[PDB]
């Protein structure tokens, strides 16, 4: 196996929480900047895996200034994690009504529609988000997952193109290359070790690659390998990676087949 | 209004947004997965015409063929909120309707003559649109004649028919120049909504208790009693009220209980699981299923049976939603017998969501409050795995009207969702009535073959039946429509008198003497009381 | 592999933090009960892996009431996690001076002396803690680790006795039985699956058993298997298990051999 | 005090605890891993006697053999804080010392006669204890004679010797009944501490700046200058002060620089890494190693060389700690030449910790402040991996006194930690002096063979040497001790006069004329200035 030390709360992270915890108890603040900090702290809480406490700070942000697309972004994500895709859609619509260039709303809404059984609607969003940056290999990967449900044959030809016409620079294209059959899973992991630098980097590489390997095996109907790989993806505590969140949701839908 | 001084209606600032919000929810979150493609927007067009011109009366065929060129564009209009075809098609026919009522007044002055052999077709729901103004004027000649004739047959002078049908037609013109931009918006969203399923709706923004409770009673056959619960609807804390009355009835040594859910059209699903629980120990009542694919079981958690005595459930074609859950559970557990007409078939849950976002007062404060939408989110399944939808609960004992094919039921609503089955839940039957049923039926059939009220019902059926061709073809001849009313009045007086001599009551010299508040007999309830006792006897 | 879903912050945990966060901002409190709650919250923070923020609440507890042995317990543990065994010893002495029946001070001081190169002094403490409850198999296991450094042969005979004279009921004795050579690692894990009930139970079983298997392989000088097993032990986020804390310290001393 | 009205000393309430706290830290956190077993507590006993009776003068052998039965018990006393043997053994000998000073006064009255052939042994550090009171009285007869004689040889009348030696002995009795319970406690903890290593200590609770800076100077040989930095100690911000002076000297075209660290006994390790940095670019200065097994490298981070000119480092047997770090680094990088005597060998770091816990004022508020302990936590290693300890920095050029075996050095302290080596650090040598060294030495040896001050030094050595048997055996004969002083005074006057005629100064008629503030020459500094120039010549 390739394993990292699971990531742990850094002292910077813990120090900032304690400061904020008190900058927010001292009533010396605009509404507009009390709201900016409550958002800043939810992102910190979120990055630690403390989604309930972040949902709390984000709701307190929008009760003060409902103008904020960034906050609807997270509210929608949590709603996607929770299984409530209807409400998720509502939140991301809000995001792109308040700011229509907020691209990452397209990815999150697209994923949300993916888990919510609406593939064709997911494709529209995931392709908008692809076309915002065709060099980012994960934008190709998410679109693949959404296509491979109706037409695997097409999904593969399209990924192949997305890869061919990209500059093939960023790590993620190695995951893409294995989906395409160019490189074995053996080689995929050789290149992972090679590309990783420190343990924080190794955890990030493993969070991603375990989720995509996870999704891959689940295609073949290998629930056992999928399950192992989702668990190992989550075992890096890269709490705010989409692959983390969605390896947990995947795991949750597999702890609802056996019941 | 004397001319085209009808205001030209325009789409309001808020509406483009409100349309986009409606489309978002319908296209993504509806139990029904549909594409808002060209085929769908074409079907939204035809529905929209049927909402403007119900009877195909007001528009020229050329009005329709012109706008119809542009009907695959409606999905774009809705998604963007640019509803130009909806507003154009409404504005014209805002004119056409004006110019039909200004024509209908002119024709009211001409001489009235009700001695022809002309008929009048009440159902132009699928007629070709008038080809020219001569045919338009002809359909509206028929219409003022039908309006005049239906009034004449209430003993009105030619003079007071013109005075009342002027009042009417002139008010039709005032209605018409008092409609607002939201009225047209509402009707565009309604064409959309109703093309998905018959329970989906848009709901416009607002413009500038113990009466519905359980009544209990007792009814005897010789020395033996039967408790009856009239349940008007599944109002919140119903199960508390029937628990009071189930104690009143348990003590008065009743041989059998009847739950009466006729024309009980639904209510809180929770009151359906809690009431099911009074009669079966524990177990699942209903499998609910969501838009995304996922099933859920509501169960009865308190393992005690508040009444184990013989139970009977009386339903009709208007028993619906929660009623069908309850009736379906009792049938499936063999806890209670089902009597009456097959039920409606409402196998679906709709949810209200607001089109209002928290940042609206903030950014667009000129706007008014926005509407809400109502749409299907869930289906119901029985514990045996079948669906309530478009099949309904079918009684163990079917009264005569239930063997007759009726035109009322979810099955007959437009784009009602189809019938489905999932896997059955795990439950243990509280009993089994397949044993008793053929005997209950031997007795039932014997009894109603004699009863004259059930003879009267089964004669009514032969009539309703034999006169279903001419069903929507009304005579415009005063003589034939005077004679038709006299033969209806005469057959009614004879029924009422056949009854009063059975009962030792004085006969009526004429139909007009009958008290305004006369109570008909309830032959269906009266025969079910017998079924209930027959069941008690057999256990 | 036997893998659990890594444990995640429960909603009870997140709700209580938010309540406390405000019961402690409302100045309606004794010194004695403000100090009791600051301790209660450090245990919660600690149970989430947020040791810096707990160290913070525990220091705020002893600045208010320095009478509290329970708080010195945690301060000492963190000091053991940090590599500072001198200060750890000082803290645990404080604990047993303020309350000499505070047995778990013996385990923590014993472990601290173990990592601090003082085996004979560790044995005295670990044997005091054994004799407080000879049925708890982990008390035997910690004493074994401390003995097996000077005399493996004796450490084994003593574990064997500790096991023979115990009632052999609680799960932990299966780990003990594998150290003794009675059962293969194959069987050890068969019995793990069998004994585990839900995922929270499975994570706890894996946190423990991976640390002891970890320590075991490290004996043979198998740094690679040790490393994998420590990482997998930590991957269950059972943050407040001694095996978690000390699989991290173990991992830290192995990321100081390669440097 | 006329009798045994000396207070009986008792252990205070706090002390049991304070003992337990000291034992905890020494037994667990000391660089030295020892067992507080029977062998250790026996050695703590012998040290404790040597602290009560330094010269084996006050106690009977029977006093010692009685308490000695109980010496393997001290580890228990310390761990528990019940220090009964320490308090008993002190109390007796609180009496014994009283009754030696009351005897010594009696004997002062007897007639004085300094004409015998008796000697006096100044070192009874390892003598057998007196066997009986006759032998006790004999050792104290010797002692008042030695005290009388040493005073007589400062020209005192038999009358004023009795007046001064009464003052002394009577004050010895007052000291004795003014000692406190903490005094005995302190000395028990000291016996413990000093049996671990010579730098470990107990420190009793408190009872009811630019003078030490760098001085710079210049010294010439013909037309060529050499800068000299006298560094009194590694005081914080030393490296700032020498940076000022390194600029003053760089500009005055000096051929060479000397750092003078003679009798510089240490200071802030950080000032040793920062000063090392002025002379070598970057690299590790010192490997520190902790009690638990773990090594650490202090480095110089600013990669610039404030002075690349030829460097020389002057050290003696009292250069220690931080000085030895600096001198060792310059030697190891071949950045600078080392001249003088091998250094002390202080290869260890001690830390202060308080015996005070935050809950003390709370729970035991009657108590006083408690002490602190000082103990070894770390060792030092050179960048080549060897240890400073008990080897010290050995000079490239060793002055004559350094080839002579002295009795001053860490090596001679009791239970000084042994010498160790770890692996070398990774560093690149800033240069290499193995090339120049044999030539610098050819010249050095030639020069000092002529110099009369170095002739005087090398004569002093032959003397100090040949008279090391009789080293601690002083004559008690006034004649022989009058003649000894005259021959010392005479040899001194001859040296001073040999010097004054070399220098063109007036000769002294007698030793007494010499100014009180006469400055001796510094032959070691003066010869190193030459070494420094020879080095400059060769690069």
Residue numbers in the entry:
A (entry chain A), C (entry chain A): 28 to 286
B (entry chain B), D (entry chain B): 27 to 234, 248 to 578
In the authors' words:
Prc (also named Tsp) is a member of the family of C-terminal processing proteases (CTPs) which features an embedded regulatory PDZ domain inserted into a serine protease domain. In Escherichia coli, Prc is involved in degrading abnormal proteins that are unfolded or partially folded and marked cotranslationally at the C terminus by an SsrA tag and that are exported to the periplasm through the Sec translocon. By associating with its adaptor protein, NlpI, Prc is also involved in the regulated proteolysis of MepS, a lipid-anchored hydrolase specific for PG cross-links. The activity of Prc strictly requires the PDZ domain, and the PDZ deletion completely abolishes the protease activity.
Prc-ΔPDZ (Prc with the deletion of residues 247 to 339) with a C-terminal His tag was also cloned into the pTrc99A vector. To assess the structural role of the PDZ domain and the hydrophobic sensor residues, which have been shown to be required for Prc activity, we also determined the crystal structures of Prc-ΔPDZ and Prc-L245A/L340G when both are in complex with NlpI. In both structures, helix h9 and the hinge region are disordered and invisible from the electron density map. Nevertheless, the structures of the bowl-like body of Prc-ΔPDZ and Prc-L245A/L340G, including the protease platform, are superimposable with the structure of the resting Prc-S452I/L252Y. The proteolytic active-site residues in Prc-ΔPDZ and Prc-L245A/L340G are also in the misaligned resting-state conformation. These structures confirm that, without the PDZ domain or the hydrophobic substrate sensor, Prc is maintained in the inactive resting state. In the absence of the PDZ domain, Prc-ΔPDZ also adopted the resting-state structure with a similarly misaligned proteolytic domain. These results support the finding that the PDZ domain regulates the protease activity of Prc by serving as an activator but not an inhibitor. In contrast, Prc-ΔPDZ, Prc-L252Y, and Prc-L245A/L340G all failed to process sFtsI. For the sNlpI–Prc-ΔPDZ complex, the crystal was grown in a solution containing 0.2 M ammonium sulfate, 0.1 M Tris-HCl (pH 8.5), and 25% PEG 3350.
